[model samples]
Target chain A: MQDVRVQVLPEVRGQLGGTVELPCHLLPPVPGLYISLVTWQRPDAPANHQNVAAFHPKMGPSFPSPKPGSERLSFVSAKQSTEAELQDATLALHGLTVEDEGNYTCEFATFPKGSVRGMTWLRV
Target chain B: MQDVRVQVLPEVRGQLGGTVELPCHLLPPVPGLYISLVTWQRPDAPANHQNVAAFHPKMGPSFPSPKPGSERLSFVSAKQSTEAELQDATLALHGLTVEDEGNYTCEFATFPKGSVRGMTWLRV
Candidate 1:
């Protein structure tokens, strides 16, 4: 497809300790492509490294996951979707805190190919 | 005051054409200092300059104002505050269209001096 549609699951405001879901999906029926990689990031994150959490195809998202360096986050994929569950890849903000509020970017990419981005904001 | 506290008026999810109020207020208790300039802008606007509307202290906010270059918007002040009503400076997005939903920034500056910023978003 020429474009992708990403969304924030249950787009709404949240309170501390509650779970927040930012589910993103692609309008699919791909001819021969699988999502090569998916990325989620905060808009104000540091510049040099992008403060990004990613899911890679080769590494597989299960036990041997490639972790980003931030301690406050963990990027885990749900069982149903591939290791690249870009849509189901949940960024659980354990013990949800006010500092968690801001715009989140859900980026979808097509290997050495194309990518599209969408944003969602959460407020405490 | 040298610095101002800008706030999002009331966080209420509104219905269409119902009117939404993004009331901003500057944290007060000042000496001889007054707000020199006030402006609001959309983050994703084109690069040439900025999709900004400004209010100047010398020109005042009452009658005969220096108008910016956009029409789908209006910059109005309340009698209770200065024409530079940077705070309480209301952006009445008439006929609230879904396209009108996004992050808005309230900016304040001191003449030949300093400035600060804050952000908020709206949704249908």
Candidate 2:
């Protein structure tokens, strides 16, 4: 039994050159629950842009296995989404620069059991 | 009994304004095992400058609990190392920009049991 929710899809226009989707959703399926990883922050809601391209909820549309100053940023793979898309965990930051905006949080990890976090706000 | 290892620290002289440390060490000690998270990456080392300020074997020095876009970047807390110091889990990246260098990976996750990742490089 596991449930977690992080949302920011109500107008979602906070543009920079334009292109945003900070969505995360996980529920009822904690297989091996080994996800235990995914942390992307920046949403005190000031100069908001967007972040966290993936959250391992048993790996469907989650991928942030590469860290240390993320290279320019690019993780747009849902491996051909079956539907939960969860906005395809999109994190494509290119062109868009007002320093690229802010407000992006998505934390999802599970093991013996102890982890669930969510925050979203990428406004221009 | 739990063991996970991820390493990358050879001639870490790679530079760009300068400052590097990507160390994660955990062996024998997996109580409650609930760490399950900590990832920071940017090292495929090409244009690198260090990363991953900490790891969580058992939280002696681990912190990465805020995700969603990451702001400006500032996380420096070891409280006070008894001396494994592990570079005091340092992530002091100020100025030092060539896009801020790369090659930084430090991932540590444990629950029922799973995870250990490490990589280091930050050069001009």
Candidate 3:
């Protein structure tokens, strides 16, 4: 049986100067099971898959070495992600531009499940 | 070009005693181009493509003739679905049972793109 499921919107739309909310959710609602890490990636960005955001499961929700096109990437509810049990792994891709139009994905590294991922497209 | 895209999680999992949320989103945030109807279906239901939920677009969000296996299906943000601009068509399947395992899909019949759909599997 599958350990868990990761859910994401199939696609999100944002205007060049507007903000868009990309969502991620973990399912089955198992008790005591939680995510150890969360990641948002731009698979087609520049060189390769890029981590726009992540949860260290600690001083988490880091945006280190962000891709060049991810300067304005922000998390909508990343700070309390662990506390929220990852009910919401939603993030915002703000100040959108033509470059932001592409595929984006989110992944959850969980204790019981190992990892689950979901993807969506960002269209201009 | 595609008018709009209807996206749903690749899959969702639920337990026999818990709840599961199925998400559907319209992309590109096209202004004026909105959903005419939103449908949640169980393609493999005992009968055939069941309409567990739908947005009549006012007089809308109807649960008419819902498949028998869908009594516990409910909408999380259905009342304001239109008011919310169809941004969130998330639904919840509550009080799950083993019979709930299968494929569920969502469709957004819109103006700009006419209609777009995505599939998501439900595992128990």
Candidate 4:
């Protein structure tokens, strides 16, 4: 895994009351790469994206104490949201608001590869 | 460097319309640690701290586009604010507002160390 990269839409448009799925996955889909951890952070993680939701295969999805903007976050899939045996870490954000318009970052943690992440800007 | 860490006050209280300095530095200073880059992020870096101000020895200070909350941020030092020859990356915040109450992170980047950061929750 020399270059494990996450692919995300540059921007996503949502409404004030609608829900949005901030998409994130590994481009080209690396077969051998096992996603040990999935972290979905926003309005902003990875230095800018706030801790929204995190998923680990050994444990499960974990989140911070309900903060101002993280209450509406949940994992799209219990195990790889996009599909099975693939690197997909999407979040189903409910009760969207104007304040939700910010950057959403998806980070993957794998062995041998420390960490890698991608960002999608949510426009409301 | 083995363990490069930024020391920041856990929390600091401020008054609205007043000014405050969020303290951050390297405790028991590492003599050989040459701070190549200093970044002060908040309300949350390292996936939480927002980009507020960045300082490099060669570039001085740089800020983001004047967004809703970043407009009130500025670097506390042209060099290292705490003092010369020590790993210091403090931030002097002005025009305190209720919105400014959150975590402030000071991150220092140096070779081999990658990056290390600390957080201070600002109360207003």
Candidate 5:
């Protein structure tokens, strides 16, 4: 297996009704390796870290229709990285409301590195 | 207008009945910015990119129910990133039948960043 490291911000704060970005990226870049998958999960939720985003090099990104009150989160950037390469798997929360505060996870899956997961906190 | 820079993979390849992802993302990173819209356009033929997917930070992602023969294209992963920022905008084409060959555009719209666009090609 290849040695891999992930980076993320310790914490991010956003104003109510404003937007905030949660950061995460990989280190010792995997050249010639394809980014098979990237995911953003919310760990504090009771059911499970709610899956926020998942991205594939070729496919693009997926954001399920938000469930009623949950429609205030998304990627800060709208561009798809794998479409080129060297994509930083970050996420954003829009119109931050009180219910949006929690711990978030950015997980990336690739060949050789297998899977690298990072965590961050968002206070709204 | 907010300056926006868009990037993309000039071309992508995939196997028959397999999956291929197109790439797109933003540059210089937008701080305190929100991705208002992201679109994958295919201008070579009938439907004109056909609205592969549209992602909103709070609203999540949207993939048009593909037509009779276009069901193979999708966001590579089932995860939504905006749910969390700095999302790399990429697109995927699944079940690469010959009909999937064409030119694609990855378009992104945001506050301050305004609107940026990139183009790529896909071969099955």
Candidate 6:
């Protein structure tokens, strides 16, 4: 009885030193499917998933829980409406570098729907 | 019904342009439990775990499958003692950079024993 899906652009292009948005949105907008967590991750290969940024209703935004803080990645969403504001699970990656080109996964955890995932590629 | 353990150095240090080994080894050496896969990964953030390198008994080493080809990471093992020879689930990282400082996880998947994991911090 729980149904929710995620949508993402097949690919996005950005210029060096510029920015792009990796969009992720929920389908049907189930009234009771409240979001518990939204995570944007890049596959690290053999195993681990690299945490890019995470959003929680209360915690706001945390970029890579570890160190070497990257100021380049941010979160954007319809609710925010502006670049400065941030949160419906979209990712904004700025200061694009050639190293930034890759696939990204947007993961959403909902109350009853469990987890929904969407993937997209970024070309810089 | 299964018990397996992984041991790793608490911390590893390397010069700006040096090489270091993030040692990971199995305890007691369980016979018949062949290593199916060995993975060295770095946590990206809220979601992803970036693949640093992977080792398969048959396929050998693969670094960051997504791209950029990081030639600095290699695998090491007692079976293969020299730097050129690799095995036994140890990860050797060379030509260290300041950007390489972080926590790394060494994961070992073995037959009949399931998965074993060890964590260590890398400082450059």
lDDT of model 3 at position B124: 88
**Ten-residue region with minimum lDDT total, candidate 1 chain A:** A60-69
Each candidate structure's TM-score, on Cα atoms with residue i matched to residue i, is: 0.40, 0.28, 0.46, 0.46, 0.45, 0.45
Off by over 4 Å in 1: A9-11, A60-72, A76-87, B1-124
lDDT of 5: 0.58
Off by over 4 Å in 5: A65-71, A77-82, B1-124
Candidate 4's residue-wise lDDT over B1-124, tens digit each? 2344567889999888978888778644555444445666553333322456666554456563232134676656447334433265667778887777787667554432234568788887
Over A25-54, each residue of candidate 2 has an lDDT whose tens digit, in order, gives 545454543444554545342212222244
Where in model 3 is the C-alpha error above 4 Å? A46-49, A68-71, A80-84, B1-124
lDDT of 5 by residue, A12-56 (tens): 887888877887787766565445556676756642225556554
B18-76, model 2: which lDDT tens digit per residue? 54443444444444343435545454422221222333333433323222112434435
Error of 4 at A124 (Å): 1.5
> Which residue segments of model 6 deviate by more than 4 Å?
A45-49, A65-70, A78-87, B1-124
iRMSD for each candidate structure, in the order shown: 19.4, 12.5, 15.9, 12.7, 14.0, 15.0
As a TM-score, model 6 comes out at 0.45
Model 3 chain A: ten consecutive residues of lowest lDDT: A61-70
Off by over 4 Å in 4: A43-49, A68-71, A78-86, B1-124
- Relative to the unseen true structure, what is the C-alpha lDDT of residue A62 in candidate 3, on a scale of 0 to 100? 53
Per-residue CA lDDT of model 1 for A43-73, tens digit only, reads 5644322334555444433211112334545
Please report, in order, the local distance difference test score of every candidate based on alpha carbons: 0.49, 0.42, 0.63, 0.60, 0.58, 0.60
Candidate 3's docking class is incorrect
User: Candidate 3's residue-wise lDDT over B27-121, tens digit each?
Assistant: 76776554545666676764223556665444435553334234777767755432545556787888887877889877654442333457899
* Candidate 2 local lDDT, residue B107: 50
Instruction: Please list all clashing residue pairs in model 3, or write none if there are none.
Output: A13-B28, B56-B60, B56-B61
